[model samples]
Target: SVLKTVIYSSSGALFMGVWNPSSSGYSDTYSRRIADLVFDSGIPYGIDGVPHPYHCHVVDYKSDVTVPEDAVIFNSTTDTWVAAHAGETAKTYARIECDRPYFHDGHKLSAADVMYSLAWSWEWTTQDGDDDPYYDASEADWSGEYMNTILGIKLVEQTDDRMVFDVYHNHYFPASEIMTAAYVVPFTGTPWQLWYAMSELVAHNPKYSWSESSEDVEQLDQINPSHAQAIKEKLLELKQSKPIPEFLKPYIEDENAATAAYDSIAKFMDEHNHAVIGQGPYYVDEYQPENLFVRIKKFDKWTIPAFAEPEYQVDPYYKTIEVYGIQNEDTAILEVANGHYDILWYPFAAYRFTGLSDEQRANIKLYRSTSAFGDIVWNPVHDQDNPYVITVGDKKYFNPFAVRKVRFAIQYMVNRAYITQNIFQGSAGPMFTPWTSTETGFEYVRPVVDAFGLTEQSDEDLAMKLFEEGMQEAAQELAKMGYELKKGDDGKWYFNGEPVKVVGLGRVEDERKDVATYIVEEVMKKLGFDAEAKIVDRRTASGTVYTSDPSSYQWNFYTEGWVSSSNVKFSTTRIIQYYSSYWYAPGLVGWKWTPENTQRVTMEEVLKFLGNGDIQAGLDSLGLSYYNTVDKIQPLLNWTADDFALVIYSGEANGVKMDSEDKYWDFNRLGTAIGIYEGYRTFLYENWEFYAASKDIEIKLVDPVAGLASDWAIRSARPVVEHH
Candidate 1:
């Protein structure tokens, strides 16, 4: 029986693009399922929470490694390495031992492909200048610079069966984590043909280039279908003419080698759409993005058992597979139980499963994804003096959601237990932090999550008291602009005797519409908000809420959804991006018109304001007294902001205080404020992924309790081939 997969009520791309899973990084569930079986990563993550090579592709990985000698360390202050001034030797080398790997289109998976993948990623990520900007010079602050520079990762040697890679140091993330970059962007064998061709099609503008981030190029892919046709034509031209471009020489190198690879490139390019050749057991037999579907036929050449030893070699599972997108999930959910579809690959609420009878439930299996979540994003600083709102001459408008306290109160106002049990139908569990409740991660903040009394419970009486406090506080701020928040005897909120209107946005396609209505009608109306739920499709809501400036007041309340990395043991980037002063997500993490963002006042900006003077009172107001704690206000005590940008960019700034034991900059203390401030992005529930298959299919799944359940749901779904 051919494995069948169906996606319903999905918002993003449906595996139609040429970019592979890692390159495109499309979060589309439909595409991800196909990629798991169709393409293989060198260091494939397993259910054991350990990363190892797929047996079908790699022979062995050299984890005990050596460092690239030229690697240099940068100091936050007096920057130096641990074994500095003739330091102890460091080990930072990793190798990929490919064992007779072959592309689906019948070509050797050589060291050339390995070198090309690493070099192309490095060029796009690290090679920074005004001439060609990766992410508007922001690339330096991101992971790309330090990933290569401090880590000093490079292709040391590309020999016959061994692809040797070297890194800078083990001073940070143990070699295991740092070296994953080796295969994070794996060799799909399209780097030279398709990605290179796409670069030429757009004259190497990184924004439009294949390496561009998903959202950065989302519109380009969705709106510009003709571009792919041009790339297809471009690929044929390059394959036929064999004229290597100057920019691509870094990846392609010579004409003879490029021409040789073109033989297999031409075979796949003519057959598939965005994805052509891969090292996996399945080759895309047909691709049709316009119809949101793809068919994959197993490569009979695949003789190795995945994640298995050579002695346990198994034949390819399922001769073919069908994957496509669909609408009307109300019916699609039942179809899974009826055995019409083998898999319903989308996250869903439990209420959708109501149609499944006792027999249907017994015959089908459901898999869940615990890290993905949904939240209510309140715009805390909506009126940023933008003309669209407060400047309308006849009347002035004020955003109640902009009030930090008002935004804060909504956390307690929305009953998470009620939402999870009643709205999500217990399909989801409550989550407070962006971090997952299912996984033991973000260790430093574990105590902080408890310290804040964060819970799934609700306190309405406390919510009302806080709401009152926020209304008065906002009224005082509004009084400065001749606006007042007044409540009439009839129990309605008034903005200067006029009813305050609120426009809330929500998804139209899925259960979020019901969630949006509950918040607006059941919650907001009782709070006296003249709230109107503007239910919209995913595309409509995303464009309206995400595209414009927050100050535009495009949306007041939004039912925001978020996805996450499920089993990562430790995560620190969340603290930097969401809560820390180290970086700014502006309105996304809930807007605050405070010095943390608007008044970061780099020590350079600080000195310009205070001029190396000892103004203790001024320092107190900036919430940045800790950037000092070095000499305790290192102004006249010898202060300079040179390389301060570098210090903050790296996560090292928080730990570099002169006071050894103090650890002056602490998340425990900062988390107190962050814990309170985080109320703005009040989380509701972790998403429950619902995938059902027929009992007769005999789906083999790696238990999610051990590792990535989503990976198992698709990778091990086929059982007919398993019986052999």
Candidate 2:
């Protein structure tokens, strides 16, 4: 039960909590990590310095940098980010350096490990003509679009200690672009040889995702009897073959080293039962997927020096972490309160903290900072003739939210203040845009927030006006498609004279249930539609939102959580992610900003306007171009696919030349937020996570929990920052 410990370390059990909803079934924990895109950083932990832990990260050895001789560079001390050139493209390479470390398996994390992970990622990032094995149109990846359109990666060199690589990216601003090229690649802490074996296995079969957690060791159906023999043979071939194999080429330039490397990968798989092994401070000691629990203990072989400031130490205060998958929120909270558990990650309403007693407040620590936020995401592209479209009888009609006014109206109807105060108990602030922060996005998001009258207030009249107009506009579009919608005396609309219904999903696991209730009952139903909403769990709700093609209109109104960067110099990144068609995610209109599709070239057109004609040729021989360049000059990679998206040219908003954050934010309303933007999600609360720990032990955790959960000093003092 209890004992006295040195320093502040607690004598009681060091509990690592997990608030899970159900079945949480993907047998492979690493594969499950891939599914949620939680790939941990490989290089020294931090956001800005390196991208090794990032899923969108790309890399090679000799991470090179190529820029025009006269290209401008950033002066972080005095200079701010601005487009110094007119339209000239710069080429730069990012340097990737690794710290010599050992995995829990007592194996060295070498350049080979980096090479193998690169091979796995490179195969998946392909263009249209490539007939790529991993290319599925519906599968969205961070590197998938940009690597094809803007960047190219190649293996440059490998050393005894680390791997080196060169990235050829079509640069816009020499200073910004150089950093962009250098920063976007990631390194894996897992053994490379292991994944390489799996890659060969996946190449033999396409039925399973190469990154699927289910592909780990075991006589699984995916790995039939033949696959087992084939993987072994392939590893042997990688080690001994005179001429390196094509697939192995990325990971090995030296044949003998491949042989040396292959032994560890093959043996590691055998020894660990194919568990995802990371060469960090900790390793998986116990993993039981069916039992819904996994344990990670400190690596005895770890040698990475403990990084510090206010007393930073490499060795964790807690030697072992027990993560138990739990479902009951009430019990989870109570357990933490009673000191039985350390942390419960399940969503806890603001009331829990407000109702905390003075006694609990003394030892209980809730780290409050705006790192997470919530919003109701609307599906505007849910119409007929799509994979995820709704089917009523045999006829398919366009989604009602397809009308721009509908999303805008719901945006007004959502009382973010009510949701914040009543539902969240003032622990959160109202967020208006995807850039989730009370402090950031002031330059761009604020003006738009005011323009649309988007305060925390629910202006029912204004929203009602838009709702009526939006629904009527939807009726007009449906009529043209030969689907007649008639309004009944009951004030509800009918589809081809059959009663129509409005439906949405509420996340039952958290505060989203209350938020969803307000939208469906107080807002959608008040507008005269018979809104039928359902409260669903995490796995169930995810199936309706993120599991399928977003355009297919799987679910209309969704309560979504927002987490990522709170600080942005400009709104371009968030805009691309949230509203722009240039980002493959076609708002309510459907289709995208791809080469085969030319309809949405917002960035290209803006660049052209700034350049006065052909962006590359027309700009100050030293300017920026919207597309990538394998270029001699004067044009685009492809007329359509290469002509990506935009920023500004002129000093203000006239040209795509605007790279200054302040000016960019100033023009937010005039730029794309007005007519072009679709009302998809309505932001409600910006949350600062409350992580309460028992005071029994001196838990060695840093303060202010500002960065993303994994980003800041959280991984037992791993240094983390973000790339600009």
Candidate 3:
């Protein structure tokens, strides 16, 4: 039976777009979808600085930093021409911000609803442009810079509970078109203030007072509403009176602490021990710690599946869903044969799927979808030519490398097919540059492979040829600075009186360290170059090298994946990982650089490169710029595409027939929605019944499209997770 069926602003309540994927916005959305992560930034809206609308699509203007075609004129400056617009007014569309129940029938979406959502987002950020002390008080924990971008909200509050949205001539208002955009629907039942209070009470260790604790702190689950209220009252008093001490202040740089807060809040909200509470259909009943054997119970309140029929069909009645965690490809198949599990996630190696008996294979399902898998990146701050320049709290390191052919050679040296065959078992393929197969028309991705010359080999003779040519290029660059590549007794060219050495850092699975080591050794021998390899854990690799810190950590070369999306502006922010901006940390590092001195310069260069759509060039510049500090930087040896898998099993419950279907699954959504890392969360979030269900035996599958469809269908038909 449906417990509740109410209407809500889909864009406003559920899918509010905030910061770019690289920034904190994506994480916030993940938390909201999966674990009720409250935002100190208020309700997120489109790039136009408005709240989410009632429509299915809320055009995220905030994510798009560039001016849109219908953008009204804001300011025409010599340095910057800002064309601003609201997502609601774009193409005669408007959005509203409201919250109700999740399973309401019929289409409640409307343009006015979206317009209101956009307005609410703007008000939340700029404090309704009143600049009130109370308003600023709310935004204190979030980014101030994200606040400054808002011009104003255009919605009028008809009452405390209702709002009327309209379009204005403000450069940021896009009132000229209406094509139906996506919206973000937030968790309803609780008011925003109440939700924020509850979230803070559980997330933070303090009693909510933001004051020094008198005793050792306890987990959020141990605290109750009374404790939360006390903390909130105390915090309010503290804000009004004395200044917050350094020790008591929340550490903005401590990502772990922030993550803990999310965990605590989620744990507290899960009334049935599901460990999560959201408007989405499935509530996480159990997270099965670290293994893949998880399960989900169907929500009894959902009404409609997002898609129908050919794309998705019900399992007849709700049944327990089980997931298997075998990492070995062969083990996954064996487990299915034994009837232990209905489905398996992507096998550690692809051959695991092929080895399954024909009988075992018959019960399985396969789903396909597009994704951003990997890329070759460049960092510029390391250039030796600019080594002495202090950019972000440290001297630049990535300067010595030459940009043109050397960078191109690094790209050519990558053998994606070899890695795929060795590690992925022919399950993987090459990725097109940045564009997802869905957005670029699938067929469009092929041209990029040929244009980028991805088929080049890394033979010893070819390596020597490239090395000789690189030396000439380096010599020319050095010649400009009164230096040359001198041939030493070793018969290898030296730049600036030193032999050229390249360091490659590969973060593939620990089992594949030898593969990386072998590749480095082979490349070095062929080029007659000095090179070393260090096999590190995946976590350590990301934290020390690819992470957004360019100062202390040194990276010469590494293999890593890149997730591509349609939002170009937001995606560019992740460039910090590959750019010289990694060297700067404002609130964390004790270094002297401040946003006033550092961020302005970094943003200018980042925006400039992004504006020109010169990701490779910008990345190369970043590598070159930083090479001067560390004296070594090389492009990625290879970037491989991820081949998806779908494992299916059919089962019956009390004579009711059940089957599964397939659809695309976005990693970001799975990670945040399911409270796991992207690497692990996909298996859990996408396979909801397999992992989060409370029932024991159930039908399950690993097909990406099928999994997504099942999740959406189950949730839409019944949007709450309760086992009884």
lDDT of each prediction vs. the true structure? 0.52, 0.47, 0.31
- Candidate structures ordered by TM-score, highest first: 1, 2, 3
RMSD of 1: 8.2
Q: Can you give the TM-score per candidate against the true fold?
A: 0.73, 0.71, 0.51
| Candidate 3 C-alpha lDDT tens digits along 100-165 | 223111112222223322322333334333433212222222322332333323332333233333
Task: Please report, as a residue range, the 10-residue window in candidate 1 with the lowest summed lDDT.
Answer: 76-85
Give candidate 1's error at residue 714 in angstroms: 3.0
lDDT by residue for model 1 over 1-724, one digit each (tens)? 5887776644454432233312333333445555666666555555534454553233333433444344323222221222121233333333334443567767656544654444445554443445653222222223453343234444445444445444433222332343333333234444455555554554444345432323454322411345545666666777666556443354343568666666566556655644356767788787665676778888876655334543223354678888767767767777778878877766565667776679989777766666567877765443445211343336566667656566667777778888888877787887766666665443433444444445788777878897898788767767776666788888888877888777788886666888889889867887888888998875566445543334555577788776542354433345444443222333321333344323222333333323235445333433442433435545322222212222222323333422221222232223323434435467677777655666656545443532223454455555543452
Question: What is candidate 2's lDDT per residue for 1-724, written digit by digit as tens?
Answer: 2211111111221111111101112222222321111123433233332222321223332323443333222222222222233243433445444444665556666555554444444444443355545433332333344433223343445555455444444433322332344444435555565455544444455543332211242221111224435555655664555324444453554656555656765564455443345565555555444545555566666643322223333344446656566555555656666667665433344566555567766655554445567777766554334312255456664466656567678777878888888877777788776555544444434544543447788888878887888777767766676777777889876776766556788866567788778888888777766677788765455445543345444466777765443233333345545554443243212344233332233334433533456744322222222222324322322222122123332121122333444334433433334322345556677875555555543434433323323323334432224465
- All candidates in order of lDDT, best leading: 1, 2, 3
**Candidate 1 whole-model C-alpha lDDT, 0 to 1:** 0.52
Q: Which parts of model 3 are misplaced by more than 4 Å?
A: 1-93, 96-99, 102-277, 286-326, 347-350, 369-372, 378-404, 420-425, 436-439, 442-487, 491-503, 508-519, 536-538, 546-548, 562-724
In TM-score terms, candidate 3 sits at: 0.51
Task: Give the winner by TM-score: 2 or 3.
Answer: 2
Candidates 1 and 3, the one with greater TM-score: 1
